[PDB]
Amino acid sequence: KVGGNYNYLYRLFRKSNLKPFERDISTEIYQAGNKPCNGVAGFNCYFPL
Amino acid sequence: RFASVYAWNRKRISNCVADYSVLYNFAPFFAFKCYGVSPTKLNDLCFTN
């Protein structure tokens, strides 16, 4: 679809490499570590999807 | 003092240990989009220049 088809997604990065045939329904934000991050933030608090 | 947009200033970085984690002294970046790489995996991969 022209600039569409968002319903099909993936992950560029994850907190850890997936195990074989492992499934993860969650989409929580990866922690930055160097900066407290419960709300959105900089370095690593970008949304995985 | 930065240069113009047409005369964009270039420096080659070579023969030096790249600490890409001194980026996070400059304040919330309207964009840190890392294309083709992750903002977290960049301080690992060695590169020529």
Swiss-Prot record, chain A:
Consequence of substituting F47L: Increased resistance to neutralizing antibodies and human covalescent sera neutralization
Domain of life: Viruses
Region called Disordered, residue ranges: 12-47
Outcome of mutating F47S: In strain: Lambda/C.37, Omicron/BQ.1.1, Omicron/XBB.1.5, Omicron/EG.5.1
Stated consequence of mutating L9R: In strain: Delta/B.1.617.2, Epsilon/B.1.427/B.1.429, Kappa/B.1.617.1, Lambda/C.37, 19B/501Y, Omicron/BA.4, Omicron/BA.5, Omicron/BQ.1.1; Contributes to cellular immunity evasion and increases infectivity
Region Immunodominant HLA epitope recognized by the CD8+, residue ranges: 5-13
Protein name: Spike protein S1
